[PDB]
Amino acid sequence: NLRSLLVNPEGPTLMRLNSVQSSERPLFLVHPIEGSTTVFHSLASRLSIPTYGLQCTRAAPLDSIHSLAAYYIDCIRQVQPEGPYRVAGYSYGACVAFEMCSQLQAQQSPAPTHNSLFLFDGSPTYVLAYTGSYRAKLTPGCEAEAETEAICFFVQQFTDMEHNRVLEALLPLKGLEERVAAAVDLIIKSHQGLDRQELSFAARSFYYKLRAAEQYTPKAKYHGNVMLLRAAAGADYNLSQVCDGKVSVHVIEGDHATLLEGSGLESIISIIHSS
Numbered sequence: 001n002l003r004s005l006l007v008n009p010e011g012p013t014l015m016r017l018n019s020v021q022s023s024e025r026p027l028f029l030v031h032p033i034e035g036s037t038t039v040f041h042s043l044a045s046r047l048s049i050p051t052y053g054l055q056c057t058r059a060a061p062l063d064s065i066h067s068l069a070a071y072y073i074d075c076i077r078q079v080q081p082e083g084p085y086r087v088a089g090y091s092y093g094a095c096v097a098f099e100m101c102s103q104l105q106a107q108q109s110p111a112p113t114h115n116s117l118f119l120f121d122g123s124p125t126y127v128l129a130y131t132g133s134y135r136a137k138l139t140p141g142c143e144a145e146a147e148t149e150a151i152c153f154f155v156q157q158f159t160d161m162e163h164n165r166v167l168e169a170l171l172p173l174k175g176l177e178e179r180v181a182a183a184v185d186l187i188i189k190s191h192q193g194l195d196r197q198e199l200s201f202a203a204r205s206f207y208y209k210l211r212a213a214e215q216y217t218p219k220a221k222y223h224g225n226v227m228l229l230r231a232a233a234g235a236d237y238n239l240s241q242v243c244d245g246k247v248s249v250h251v252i253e254g255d256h257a258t259l260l261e262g263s264g265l266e267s268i269i270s271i272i273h274s275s
């Protein structure tokens with residue numbers, strides 16, 4: 001459903017995803033690349049702990065994953081001022097969640113830290129694998145081509161349009177803003193009822209989200225423990241390279257998308273409740 005690929009750019013960053021009321025510290029869930037928390041609805045409805053989502057709105061600083069993570073920590077502190085924190089992220093959000101817990105590690109130091117980090121099918125290197133495959137198609141150092149490729153991909157998620165006619169429409173344009181405007185007009189032609197400003201924000205932010213992920217490396221190894229629940233990047237999605245604590249891995253049924261529903265979901269729920 002296409003509006004699941006959209007965010008209200010003026011919506012709240014932190015959102016309560018279930019109605020559990022207790023003194024148990026909440027679980028905070030970080031969005032996948034599209035920025036919305038829709039993918040977490042089934043999980044949140046089932047969890048017995050208060051559950052919040054983080055969505056990516058116009059207010060989010062996207063200059064780096066470092067900045068995005070710091071902003072999300074500021075947001076979480078409006079409901080839970082002190083740790084320890086329970087944070088999970090899915091896909092693109094796994095890298096953000098990793099960086100959030102890394103910043104929490106470094107902030108609560110030198111005191112021993114006890115945060116819980118769950119990565120649902122992602123890691124600091126997970127997005128990079130995707131971006132490199134597309135970079136392979138492009139003239140080195142040509143920003144215009146990278147913008148074009150990203151925005152073309154975006155259009156193809158919202159329309160049945162053929163790749164080359166969209167690429168060719170976007171390539172010669174003046175800059176990102178013109179590419180975004182062209183993309184939104186193409187999507188609106190197909191889907192007249194979608195919101196123009198939601199689409200514009202989604203398109204622009206898609207490019208900046210990808211740039212931030214491409215440029216990201218952790219500042220230091222994470223010393224806390226990590227639970228990877230996953231569907232080359234290898235068995236642990238390269239986490240041993242950036243973690244000096246325990247990296248526990250469990251393989252969940254489904255693909256990169258269905259793991260948060262059906263069978264995968266039952267496993268995730270069980271592991272959250274135990275660990």
Ligand SMILES: *[P@@](=O)(CCCCC/C=C\C/C=C\C/C=C\CCCCC)OC
Nearest residue numbers: 032033091092130134149150153210211
């Ligand atoms: P997850 O959040 C998926 C995480 C990976 C998302 C990236 C997937 C595809 C990238 C598509 C196009 C990028 C093309 C341009 C290459 C240059 C990069 C631009 C900065 O699950 C939803």
